[PDB]
Symmetry: C3
Subunit: 432 residues, 3 copies
Amino acid sequence: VACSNNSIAIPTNFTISVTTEILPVSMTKTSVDCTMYICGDSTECSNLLLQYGSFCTQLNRALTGIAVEQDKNTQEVFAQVKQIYKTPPIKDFGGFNFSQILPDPSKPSKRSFIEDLLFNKVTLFIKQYGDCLDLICAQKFNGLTVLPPLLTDEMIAQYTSALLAGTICSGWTFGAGPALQIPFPMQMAYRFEGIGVTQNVLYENQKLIANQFNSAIGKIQDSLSSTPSALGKLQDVVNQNAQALNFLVKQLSSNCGAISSVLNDILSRLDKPEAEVQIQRLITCRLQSLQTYVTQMLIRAAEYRASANLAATKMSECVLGQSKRVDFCGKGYHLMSFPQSAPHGVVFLHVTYVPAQEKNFTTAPAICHDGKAHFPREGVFVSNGTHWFVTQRNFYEPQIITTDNTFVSGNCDVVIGIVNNTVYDPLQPELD
Amino acid sequence: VACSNNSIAIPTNFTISVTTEILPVSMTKTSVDCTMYICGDSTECSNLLLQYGSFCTQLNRALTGIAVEQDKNTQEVFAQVKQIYKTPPIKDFGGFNFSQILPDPSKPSKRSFIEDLLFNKVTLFIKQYGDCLDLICAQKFNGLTVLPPLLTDEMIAQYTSALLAGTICSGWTFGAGPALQIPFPMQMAYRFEGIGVTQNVLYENQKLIANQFNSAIGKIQDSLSSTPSALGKLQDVVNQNAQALNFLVKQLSSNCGAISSVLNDILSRLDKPEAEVQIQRLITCRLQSLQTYVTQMLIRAAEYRASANLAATKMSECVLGQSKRVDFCGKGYHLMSFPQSAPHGVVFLHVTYVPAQEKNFTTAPAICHDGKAHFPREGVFVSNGTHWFVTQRNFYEPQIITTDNTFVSGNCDVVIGIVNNTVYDPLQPELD
Amino acid sequence: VACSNNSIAIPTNFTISVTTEILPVSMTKTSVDCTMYICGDSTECSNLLLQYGSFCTQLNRALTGIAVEQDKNTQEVFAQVKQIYKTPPIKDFGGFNFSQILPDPSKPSKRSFIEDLLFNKVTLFIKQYGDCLDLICAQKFNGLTVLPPLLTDEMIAQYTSALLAGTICSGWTFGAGPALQIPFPMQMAYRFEGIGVTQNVLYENQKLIANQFNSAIGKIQDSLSSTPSALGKLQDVVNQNAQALNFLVKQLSSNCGAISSVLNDILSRLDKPEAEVQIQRLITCRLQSLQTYVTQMLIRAAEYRASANLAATKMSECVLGQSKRVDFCGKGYHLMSFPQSAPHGVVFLHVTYVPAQEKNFTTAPAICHDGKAHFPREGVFVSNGTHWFVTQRNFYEPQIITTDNTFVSGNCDVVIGIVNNTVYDPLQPELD
Ligand SMILES: *[C@@H]1O[C@H](CO)[C@@H](O[C@@H]2O[C@H](CO)[C@@H](O)[C@H](O)[C@H]2NC(C)=O)[C@H](O)[C@H]1NC(C)=O
Ligand SMILES: *[C@@H]1O[C@H](CO)[C@@H](O[C@@H]2O[C@H](CO)[C@@H](O)[C@H](O)[C@H]2NC(C)=O)[C@H](O)[C@H]1NC(C)=O
Ligand SMILES: *[C@@H]1O[C@H](CO)[C@@H](O[C@@H]2O[C@H](CO)[C@@H](O)[C@H](O)[C@H]2NC(C)=O)[C@H](O)[C@H]1NC(C)=O
Ligand SMILES: *[C@@H]1O[C@H](CO)[C@@H](O[C@@H]2O[C@H](CO)[C@@H](O)[C@H](O)[C@H]2NC(C)=O)[C@H](O)[C@H]1NC(C)=O
Ligand SMILES: *[C@@H]1O[C@H](CO)[C@@H](O[C@@H]2O[C@H](CO)[C@@H](O)[C@H](O)[C@H]2NC(C)=O)[C@H](O)[C@H]1NC(C)=O
Ligand SMILES: *[C@@H]1O[C@H](CO)[C@@H](O[C@@H]2O[C@H](CO)[C@@H](O)[C@H](O)[C@H]2NC(C)=O)[C@H](O)[C@H]1NC(C)=O
Ligand SMILES: *[C@@H]1O[C@H](CO)[C@@H](O[C@@H]2O[C@H](CO)[C@@H](O)[C@H](O)[C@H]2NC(C)=O)[C@H](O)[C@H]1NC(C)=O
Ligand SMILES: *[C@@H]1O[C@H](CO)[C@@H](O[C@@H]2O[C@H](CO)[C@@H](O)[C@H](O)[C@H]2NC(C)=O)[C@H](O)[C@H]1NC(C)=O
Ligand SMILES: *[C@@H]1O[C@H](CO)[C@@H](O[C@@H]2O[C@H](CO)[C@@H](O)[C@H](O)[C@H]2NC(C)=O)[C@H](O)[C@H]1NC(C)=O
Ligand SMILES: *[C@@H]1O[C@H](CO)[C@@H](O[C@@H]2O[C@H](CO)[C@@H](O)[C@H](O)[C@H]2NC(C)=O)[C@H](O)[C@H]1NC(C)=O
Ligand SMILES: *[C@@H]1O[C@H](CO)[C@@H](O[C@@H]2O[C@H](CO)[C@@H](O)[C@H](O)[C@H]2NC(C)=O)[C@H](O)[C@H]1NC(C)=O
Ligand SMILES: *[C@@H]1O[C@H](CO)[C@@H](O[C@@H]2O[C@H](CO)[C@@H](O)[C@H](O)[C@H]2NC(C)=O)[C@H](O)[C@H]1NC(C)=O
Ligand SMILES: *[C@@H]1O[C@H](CO)[C@@H](O)[C@H](O)[C@H]1NC(C)=O
Ligand SMILES: *[C@@H]1O[C@H](CO)[C@@H](O)[C@H](O)[C@H]1NC(C)=O
Ligand SMILES: *[C@@H]1O[C@H](CO)[C@@H](O)[C@H](O)[C@H]1NC(C)=O
Ligand SMILES: *[C@@H]1O[C@H](CO)[C@@H](O)[C@H](O)[C@H]1NC(C)=O
Ligand SMILES: *[C@@H]1O[C@H](CO)[C@@H](O)[C@H](O)[C@H]1NC(C)=O
Ligand SMILES: *[C@@H]1O[C@H](CO)[C@@H](O)[C@H](O)[C@H]1NC(C)=O
């Protein structure tokens, strides 16, 4: 790294970067009916399952609780707007093209282009249950059932659309109060100053910025199509849950010391006093297998709550406002964030400002005018050869050092690195 | 939602809103003495429980660890001030009435009015243990005991009182260093500018603001008295723990394949070599039931740690400072937060600023004076018909556009939406 | 606490404080090979372990998953910089001495002095495995093995060094974009204004500040050497994991109702049909003991993920930037943070600004000049006896009230506490 005693580097150009962050929000809601799972509707087992007390009750309630939380997680992340907003047929945003994030009415569920890519990338035992369709299926899947969400894909898509329409047409104001319309270019102006970059930069370079933005968005399609760009975070949710269910199914073929894995064969060709023992032994193992499954699900559920809580936080701080937290809403300086829906989760597109080309300048902590030390009101002092200028830290825009750009504090005998120069007084030429 | 290409909406009025957020901090500390729980002080079981190794040791330590954490959670949230502060007998806060949050010496535990409402709203097996009062009770409750907190309700109330006295008389300064006294109206002035609202608004509308505040507080009583306003978050802590204990008790009546659920009846009327088997079978089930209980408690404890950590964060960022994080300290723009104690948790009253009435104005990104582009130093440009003004974004207070309200950057041929107008120079009239 | 109606306290001096925060990041990666752990390579057990299905498969995968996460946790916290940076041989930082945090080439692993203290303070069954060295050891430790980290101490130290070199020579810029060199004294200047303290304070008191800093660092050695200054947070990780392993080992000596705890003795002197029963009974208990162990490890792993996530957040917000969050990066106002490596965790040295000596002044919300109310542009109005001044809140530096220090809003009949005084107009003396 460069290191200096008397010099400074300042960016002369910048780029706009759009990055993708993918967070899990929820998982497929499932339930296992302990009694039929273990006994298979056999009478002898059912009676021998009551002597064990309320284990099935606790396990059923543990799983029910998880299923309920999955809907809470979803609404906490997505349902942050009470109103449903729509964009006008007029797309006049100053050169900013949002056609890939806005809903397309010709598409299924009226998803946007990018959302359609996400849905067709994540690959979703569960399908077999969906195909047989609820008791009739439960009788075939050993008490393992799948429950529908309260919010369907369309409902979630509507929330996402409303959030986007709000963000684009009214900035962040709708997240605190009433939605206040404002031209997109002006929202950007106020987001630029919000990261220490004077608003004039946007207006003067608006065309370039719009072009960099539009290209940055197009590149998203290639990133998603080329590799599992954090898509594995959602694919793993599917895979981990699927194999957990496969475990339960496989265990129903185990003996665990029992004469067989089939209750009908235990009862057949065996006197009652022993069949009771073989059944109890099989019940014990199946119950333990079920406990193992539930314990794992309780822990995973906790992980998803934490993820959902983070996703909800991101919605509030990245999308409905402008974060000052470093690397919270992506690398670089945060400007905007645009959410997209996804299978079992939420995807955030983070728009950030990043410095590019830079130059070396000679610097100084203060300027000595006439026995008094002048400090910069905003920015730093730099020398471009034989002349000194004051400029904002994040963009090399040199300006003349004047009495309106500095303040006087203390004398020239106090500051160690103070440099002799002339501060321009803008009023004297008017008197003379 | 409204959407525009050339116009803007600006709030002309505002209201003050007070919302309530309720977080769990801790749960009743309990402990189960594995050996007596399982064996009931029987000799035969005790001896047959040693052959199983250190299961009871691990379970006892798991529960002990949870109980310890409950006190850590409490002190981390509440004990953030080393000193105990008291308010003066003189309540001169500029019209702001805090009588409902400040401690009332005539009340039990010297709680405030609102706190008394919270304590009389949350409804608290455990009571039966409290009534029998420690070994004597343990012998009757099957090894299930309840431990006292290190910090009693009075001690917690004192911490809350100290935090409130600090917040009211010294703002946030005491949270970083020494407590620096400052008039309440001045603290508010500095909290208003902190959300982008010029301090003159407070002083000019101080009476209205104090009235809106006082009414907002009164409405809290109705919200708590009318419905379980997030009070269910605390009632659920009680209910979930109570039923977990009920499960353990119920399981002590189960056979789990054993000849009976009573150790005395297993030993009676049965030869030793078989009684050993029946006892071992019963021990196995009771131990498994205990493991199930402990596992659930470990997971719930984790949830409470996370909640307590959040509550501690809120204390630091909402109460002892001014959050910039969106929707972190309630909806709207954060001004102040006043904590209140509660059964097994903490309640935060969040005071936020919310925009109200609004009007439509015509806008522009810049003004063109004489071949140079003028940008607003702070706020936006708006037209009220035939005249242009500059005003702060969050409150419609129109001012004349002058050379002291703008800065010059670039020329008039660069900015797309630039509007021709006159910028007033305040010095020329003095020369002439 | 002091409380006032018409007065204010303002700090006249300050100190620099350095505090230490210690967070766990990861734990020793271990694995238990279920099959050999339970059966001890006996044939009879191995065959009788297959009838139980996929319990060993699930347990092995549960532990494997934990081990993998431990490396993820480490890289997320430390590997936030792609480049490896080095400091120059010239230590010209304006009087700031970093010799205790920078790497010393004469030391083992090229650690810094403070890091060496941390490594020699935390005390690390596991050592016995390390001493026997992988199957050969597994055969002696009952299937309990220890895995190496992907990032060795040297690699982690290099990341820490790179982060420090960056922080010192280029501030926070390298965390957002390219590394931009800047004199250390200037970085501090921009961190002081970042907490509401005018930059002139640093330059005028640079020597004092450097001295306070250097002493604050030296005191760290005494804090670590004198007491377990949060070092218990790392020692507990070692202790908790060690005893968990000791539990597994102890359980291999239990009978759990079996004829003995030794498979060779169960098989010897016992007919096969019964040996099968005694083995199955022993397998059941050993498997349950293993399940208990794994469950505990899954929960602890979750705690470490949460801790690692916080540590990663601190790296981004405290070290690679400047936090505005209260008490997030230590008590007082945050300036800088310097990370140090440690056994199984990360240590943050937080540099904060704290107000010291203070004085009482009489205050006012506004000044009335000639029928119009003047409000302070920045800071507060105070009286030092018979004269009024305007000064910044966090440091008593009184200045004359002028037209350039205030703004006019409304008239003198609106503000309640307004005080009659004279505002100085700096231009009139030039005309006259
Ligand atoms: C700042 O960087 C941008 C690129 O991000 C430069 O814009 C490009 O300029 C070249 C000509 O040198 C054109 O061929 C490209 O088409 C432009 N790109 C875009 C998106 O318009 C810009 O000129 C640079 N500005 C400075 C001062 O260096
Ligand atoms: C916004 O971007 C989209 C996507 O590139 C543009 O739509 C393309 O327009 C070209 C030219 O007519 C067609 O050849 C492509 O097939 C269109 N792509 C798609 C997916 O429809 C759209 O024209 C751009 N709008 C604006 C105002 O720039
Ligand atoms: C340092 O800044 C000065 C002032 O901008 C530069 O001098 C100007 O150079 C331009 C040509 O690029 C001339 O048209 C101006 O008339 C010059 N102004 C003055 C006051 O001389 C100077 O060249 C810069 N130093 C370097 C090395 O570029
Ligand atoms: C900045 O200017 C001052 C004069 O205003 C310089 O101070 C003088 O330096 C000369 C030597 O060249 C001495 O003989 C004078 O007695 C000094 N006068 C005073 C009032 O100190 C100062 O050295 C200049 N600083 C720099 C960096 O050039
Ligand atoms: C801003 O809103 C407040 C109400 O929140 C208005 O104050 C009320 O004004 C009516 C008269 O129209 C009185 O009857 C109420 O008693 C007032 N309420 C309070 C709490 O004082 C205020 O006038 C509005 N101001 C503007 C400019 O619209
Ligand atoms: C602060 O608010 C309290 C609560 O309304 C006021 O106390 C009430 O005062 C009225 C008038 O004397 C009584 O009729 C009520 O019974 C009182 N309520 C209670 C709970 O005591 C109190 O006067 C207000 N103080 C100020 C300065 O406004
Ligand atoms: C736009 O602003 C101007 C200036 O404030 C308004 O004109 C003033 O109107 C008031 C009456 O409300 C008169 O007393 C002032 O003398 C007028 N000033 C000038 C310069 O004409 C104008 O009415 C506003 N436009 C609209 C539609 O209200
Ligand atoms: C702002 O004022 C400028 C003049 O200072 C206008 O520019 C002139 O426009 C007329 C047409 O009406 C041309 O004939 C002149 O040659 C232009 N002069 C220059 C220097 O460009 C400009 O059009 C005005 N803009 C608006 C929006 O009214
Ligand atoms: C502010 O406090 C510092 C100490 O933190 C004071 O500096 C000390 O001053 C005494 C003399 O009174 C010296 O003996 C010490 O050696 C100084 N300490 C250091 C580190 O230099 C400083 O004088 C105080 N300033 C004010 C205005 O009170
Ligand atoms: C930075 O601090 C270190 C630590 O105190 C200084 O090193 C000491 O220097 C003295 C004087 O030569 C020796 O007696 C000590 O034994 C040194 N300590 C160690 C650990 O080496 C170092 O000189 C200081 N550097 C600067 C520029 O102040
Ligand atoms: C209030 O402030 C005034 C102005 O600074 C103080 O008066 C000055 O006191 C110094 C001595 O310390 C004299 O040298 C100045 O000439 C005085 N200036 C004026 C205008 O009188 C005043 O002493 C301060 N009040 C108190 C109690 O210290
Ligand atoms: C601030 O000065 C104004 C005068 O500019 C004072 O107002 C006058 O007070 C006298 C009584 O002493 C009355 O007789 C005058 O009629 C008032 N004039 C006006 C325009 O109101 C005001 O009292 C002074 N305020 C303070 C705190 O001294
Ligand atoms: C650069 O280093 C020299 C010592 O070699 C020092 O005297 C000078 O003051 C430093 N420059 C600045 C701006 O500090
Ligand atoms: C600035 O100087 C350093 C060496 O001190 C060099 O490595 C770096 O490339 C220079 N940067 C520019 C833009 O010239
Ligand atoms: C409003 O839209 C028109 C196109 O219909 C455009 O020419 C004009 O510049 C827009 N107004 C502003 C302020 O951008
Ligand atoms: C502003 O104009 C929109 C239509 O463009 C309208 O719906 C809205 O109600 C108007 N707001 C006000 C305060 O007039
Ligand atoms: C101080 O208290 C009195 C009442 O005793 C009040 O009249 C005065 O306005 C208060 N001072 C300030 C600055 O508010
Ligand atoms: C300020 O006044 C209070 C009493 O109102 C007193 O306790 C405090 O010590 C005083 N502070 C100073 C610096 O004099």
